[PDB]
Symmetry: C3
Amino acid sequence: MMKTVNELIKDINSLTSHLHEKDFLLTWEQTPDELKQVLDVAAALKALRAENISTKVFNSGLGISVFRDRFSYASALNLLGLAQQDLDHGETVRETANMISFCADAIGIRDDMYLGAYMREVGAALDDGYKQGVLPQRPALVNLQCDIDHPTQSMADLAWLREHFGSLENLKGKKIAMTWAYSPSYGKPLSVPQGIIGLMTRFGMDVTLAHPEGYDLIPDVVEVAKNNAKASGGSFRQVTSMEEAFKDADIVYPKSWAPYKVMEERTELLRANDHEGLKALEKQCLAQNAQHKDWHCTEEMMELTRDGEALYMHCLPADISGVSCKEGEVTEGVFEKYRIATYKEASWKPYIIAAMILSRKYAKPGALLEQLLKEAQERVK
Amino acid sequence: MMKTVNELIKDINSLTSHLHEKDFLLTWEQTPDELKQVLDVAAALKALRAENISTKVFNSGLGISVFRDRFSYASALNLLGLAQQDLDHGETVRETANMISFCADAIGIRDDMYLGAYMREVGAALDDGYKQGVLPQRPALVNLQCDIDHPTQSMADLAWLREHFGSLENLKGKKIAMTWAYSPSYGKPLSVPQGIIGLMTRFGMDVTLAHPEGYDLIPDVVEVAKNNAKASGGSFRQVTSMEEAFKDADIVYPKSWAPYKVMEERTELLRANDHEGLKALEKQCLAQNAQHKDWHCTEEMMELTRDGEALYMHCLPADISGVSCKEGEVTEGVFEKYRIATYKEASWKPYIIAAMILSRKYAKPGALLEQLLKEAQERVK
Amino acid sequence: MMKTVNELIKDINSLTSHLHEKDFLLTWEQTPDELKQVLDVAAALKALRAENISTKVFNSGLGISVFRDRFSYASALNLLGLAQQDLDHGETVRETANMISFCADAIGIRDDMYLGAYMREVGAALDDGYKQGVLPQRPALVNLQCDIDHPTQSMADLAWLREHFGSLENLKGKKIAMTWAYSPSYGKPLSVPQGIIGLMTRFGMDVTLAHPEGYDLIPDVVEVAKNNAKASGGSFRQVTSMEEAFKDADIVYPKSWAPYKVMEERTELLRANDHEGLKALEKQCLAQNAQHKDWHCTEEMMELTRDGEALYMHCLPADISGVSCKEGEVTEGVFEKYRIATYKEASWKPYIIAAMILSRKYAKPGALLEQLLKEAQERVK
């Protein structure tokens, strides 16, 4: 609706934001108004797109993809009119940042390395190239996933929660279980669960985190979650069993990850081409994980949630038992029931990424949307 | 010409089609009007493009490429204004279809697997995502090649025949020899010859299929060909020698393929990572094929065709003896003579693919072309 | 400025050029007016882009990348509105050229092979396809690097020299040292130093070439350099030491390359899949190069140049000692000092490549720029 978008624009224009002066790396480094800006902008873009109104903001320009280690970033670039180009390294990051940015209005970085920086160096390098007149524009920087957070996934998940439940206010008092789940694939990043507990705790939700012993998340993020919950009127709890977390839950998000000590050692020999050390590491982790195969989102597990009908969430693809693999994170039956939910959840990501790009490029994204809405250029003829 | 295109549009508007409600997987599942629609739309797009008129229909949107196993699909997407994105699996096809389609207006699938489905599951999954409101558009589905048919190649070949010979009516009574030819490369799909005999038999042509013993096409397609010929006033004949087929031919199409029993076993160990079984299979096939090296389109062979001047057809690239390889499907001399013909033949493919996309998206593609023609936006400034 | 661009257009319109009738393969096959056209067009595009004016000339169309063996070509295509598509062979070049060009307005070729042709065959094949009506447009051909020249790099380097020093006239009498420098990576092409001495000698500069014994450039290019210098009032000198070349230099360009006899043998076994011969060749070259590790652009070396403040040039990436590698072409400290210079130098490449494409497509690129300037369509909304 023109009405829906007009209301979104009034909401956006009323917000105080400085996203135009910084990079959206971690959700917990953004204020509540800034988070709300990205969500509302994403909502306006999705609604415009739904009614065949073009949201093309760039007539030319590149969005670069940099991978330190699938469709959302490319979709977001294309939505705004940018063309994607992939990059086919920590020590040289600064020179590479400038080299790829002459005609780039966005750079998206997916980073798998755990060592206890990279994207902050990229941002400082972009600032330098722009301030010294090397770059005609300062590219927007998109965190497509780092060792600490996965803001693009977490924000899209929150945008979906807000659609599903009707508002952000309606999320207060809702119980969400962020749990581990078994995967045949070792070495999944801790970015997602950290991103979830880091963000959800800011909206007064009752967040329960559950995982087997040894799979602890980074201590600094746990402490952010606890402090977020205090200030937003929510709660944060850590438990040792999946059932514990699932009981009376409104929302379950059962997804595998590797211990961060594993990711560290994987990273070290990944850097050293130690292929044999790898297969040795992989072989062990697969054995550590196999004793927790019972962390499996089954019909029996869902029965314990509120009304036995919690909203099931997971980022796509999921490891579906008997489909994708022999034993995975969720059964065929539970996935079939919630398939449309998980699709709608994923559908928000391109809009969230596009909103992040716009929020860096325009101090007042609400002005830009009103312009797009008034021109009402068709997307398809 | 504006006149040429105006006549094409009147032709298109007079046709009865339901391509907007189904996927163009097999040419023989389409009616004669529906085939004619794709051909006429492709012709209008080619003519518009030739006189520097933009045929951009999308201001943003993705076309996804999915490969189960080169330039035409990307060219077609770009012609209409879509950006190509490739996918870098049968069991998970449904979830993948939705995951890649949020911002896609087209999906192109090239499928090499022989097992006796995939694209029909994709289509049903797209229908589901659209009907449940996951996908804001139902993407057009393009068969870039399957185990059964290669409609994109066969239709472009027919569009060329129609240009070369002047009309579809002029194709009645023309003899076309679809023959095997020797290739150093084992494991070429049976899609092309099946596609050719499945389509050409619908236009009253005299279709002769020839191949060594053991290289039989799928029985179901042979029967479609025979039944097509009956109803269109054409003929279909199977012969055991290349000369037999070439004699008095108006058109020759001499191209290698592997027996379907070979493709089956290749597929099985391809799925099982049996690299050793592969090199063993390859080694044998190369020996089976080498006894038919004589299936070679030479100057001597062309002399037997009508006037010794049949139109030579082949999809690009061809295995050219002494150029691409030691011994192949056609000699350097015959290819040099027909090179421009084979280039023009290939030039139709992007237009055919684009016409298929448009034919799914618009019930009346003739309306859309008239709009494009009236706006007459330049392609190049 | 509108004024700056208006003056550039008057400059361009006053030039005599036939670049619209040939391919820009080697800078020394172009006249001085033709070189100046590319430079001035590149300058106009850069200035337009800087003030948010769209230089989109194509509403659809492909630019193909062909690699015989990173961001500039894609950036240039996108600047003009073309979409990049990569090609994933000498004997079949002619057929491939047509096959990829139906919807291409540009083809970019990077060629690493040394054997004593390829791009000239591509150009003749494009001419044929266009003249016989196969191709609706004759694609522009861009040399992204060959065994002989790297015009795209050399022209961007000259465009930067002209910006840095203020004019082409201001380059007369300037001393530029094109020297070898040590790299841990064997097998760098001789294209760059040949391109530099082949071009710079045409503007009355005092060009000094320096390298260890055995690293001689192709004799034919050396002779072009010597003859260029004579006719432009410059000089060309060959020396045996880096210090010799660096002394009193205004500009230093210290970059590694392999002897051309090495590149020949690398090419031969590259064609023959001789992996073992390769590692054997690599192992030897690394030992030949290691005795010249002293060819290192250090702070001490820079002190010998004019005022100890020569402009340092290098194409990106550089091998930076202690950063990219243990020992390389330039120290961390010298690179930090000149980093912005090398970035600005690289920033010209997309504009140079785009100017080459425009210079082939329009006999009078000045007309096209005036049109772009008058429309003043925004790049970003």
